[PDB]
């Protein structure tokens, strides 16, 4: 009757490498007890932004399904992860619906992500024909054209590559620091419980 076990939060939060913005990886958590106390240790002076659950009383609540989304974005752009925002990274790479019942965690990570030589391994899309529906992922790298002439796999004027590259460096101001973001989504009171913290009889 008791789910016991342990939720793999340490694997999600402390993974060696996180995905890029346009190819954010989704992970599912189930059949374990969630201890939302190690969370406060990571980014302790940084604030959890939760959107429908009080972060203090989150321990005593059972969730039907928990999904974790991880990526790496620039500093000042983190404010775009909130629901209802508009911008380049909130409309061309990753958008949240305006019904989001979850909580987002962000912390400056300019100790292992960025390098003095410059980190070009993180990419982001810049050009799209139209908007993207909430919680969508596109990896296709077909060349996007805005003029009249068709693009037969070419570059230059009036024909651009949709993927641009972040250029992270140590001695940059807050805003150009690589921020690692993990957002947790879970809905309430609509299905049998699968994951939650301590509970007795």
């Amino acid at each position, epitope marked *: 009757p008791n789910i016991t076990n342990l939720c793999p939060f340490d694997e999600v939060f402390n993974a060696t490498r996180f995905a890029s913005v346009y190819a954010w990886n989704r992970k599912r958590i189930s059949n374990c007890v969630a201890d939302y106390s190690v969370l406060y240790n990571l980014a302790p*002076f940084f604030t959890f932004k939760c959107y429908g659950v009080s972060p203090t009383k989150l321990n005593d609540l059972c969730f039907t399904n928990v999904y974790a989304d991880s990526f790496v974005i620039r500093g000042d752009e983190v404010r775009q992860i909130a629901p209802g925002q508009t911008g380049k990274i909130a409309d061309y790479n990753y958008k949240l619906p305006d019904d989001f019942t979850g909580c987002v965690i962000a912390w*400056n990570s300019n100790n292992l992500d960025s390098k*003095v*030589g410059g980190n070009y391994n993180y990419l982001y899309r810049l050009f799209r024909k139209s908007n993207l529906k909430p919680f969508e992922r596109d990896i296709s790298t077909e060349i996007y054209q805005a003029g009249n002439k068709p693009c037969n796999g070419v570059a230059g004027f009036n024909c651009y590559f949709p993927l641009r590259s972040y250029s992270f460096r*140590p*001695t*940059y*101001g807050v*805003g150009h*620091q690589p921020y690692r973001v993990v957002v947790l989504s879970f809905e309430l009171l609509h299905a049998p419980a699968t994951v939650c913290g301590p509970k007795k009889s």
Partner: antibody, heavy 120, light 111 residues
Framework: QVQLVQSGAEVKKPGASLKVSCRAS????????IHWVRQAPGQGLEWMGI???????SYAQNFRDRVTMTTDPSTSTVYMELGSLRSEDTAVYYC??????????????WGQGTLVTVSS | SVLTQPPSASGTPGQRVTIPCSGS????????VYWYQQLPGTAPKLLVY???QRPSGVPDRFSVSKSGTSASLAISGLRSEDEADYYC?????????????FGGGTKLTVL
């Protein structure tokens, strides 16, 4: 046998460019970062940049846009050049080693020091 | 120079003297604090790193403590061989930029 050797310099003129080299020996050169610092006479200390022994570099905001410094893993020498000097930049320049990871340094070796004077 | 130090300090031999380095959350709150000593006419050296340990070839006479958002270097058993300036260093991340902010440098005198 760890040391960071430099070369002396003489007076300059405003608007010119000055170049100094830091040479290391006795240890694996392509393993440790390099830090640059400047100390005005009768004043404190302020550092300039961090460098891979073979690669790029990063510079502080105050001393950006006018410093250029490359790598040369042939004689284990790293050169730095400052352009558009001014009479307020007269100081002593030091090069220091660092821990291989950096980002939390312990500047144990330091350079002899180059005196830079800018007067007309 | 966000780091704040007293420009001058003095003490009699055998007296415990404390040199403070008071910073902020960005520079002293998150990262380590390193203490360097510069004799006149010589390049700076290393005295204390990591708030606990010291390099080889350095006596255990100097002690370091860190509290809140500030640090202190106490020199028990002061002697005549401590006529040098003391600098505190800590990586600082700010809205404008980021780097190794240093201190003004305290000129310590022995009577």
């Amino acid at each position: 046998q760890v040391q960071l050797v430099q070369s002396g310099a003489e007076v300059k003129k405003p608007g010119a460019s000055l170049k100094v080299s830091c040479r290391a020996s006795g240890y694996t050169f392509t393993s440790h970062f390099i830090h640059w610092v400047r100390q005005a006479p009768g004043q404190g200390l302020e550092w300039m940049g961090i460098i891979n022994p073979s690669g790029g570099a990063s510079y502080a905001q105050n001393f950006r846009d006018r410093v250029t410094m490359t790598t040369d893993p042939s004689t284990s020498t790293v050169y730095m050049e400052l352009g558009s000097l001014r009479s307020e930049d007269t100081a002593v320049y030091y090069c220091a080693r660092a821990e291989g990871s950096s980002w939390l340094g312990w500047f144990d070796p330091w350079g002899q020091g180059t005196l830079v004077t800018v007067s007309s | 120079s966000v780091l704040t130090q007293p420009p001058s300090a003095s003490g009699t031999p055998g007296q415990r003297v404390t040199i403070p380095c008071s910073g902020s959350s960005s520079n002293i709150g998150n990262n380590y604090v390193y203490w360097y000593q510069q004799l006149p006419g010589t390049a700076p050296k290393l005295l204390v790193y990591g708030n606990n340990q010291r390099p080889s070839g350095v006596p255990d006479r100097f002690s370091v403590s860190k509290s809140g958002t500030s640090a202190s270097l106490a020199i028990s058993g002061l002697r005549s061989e401590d006529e040098a300036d003391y600098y505190c260093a800590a990586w600082d991340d700010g809205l404008s930029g980021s780097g190794w902010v240093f201190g003004g440098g305290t000129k310590l005198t022995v009577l």
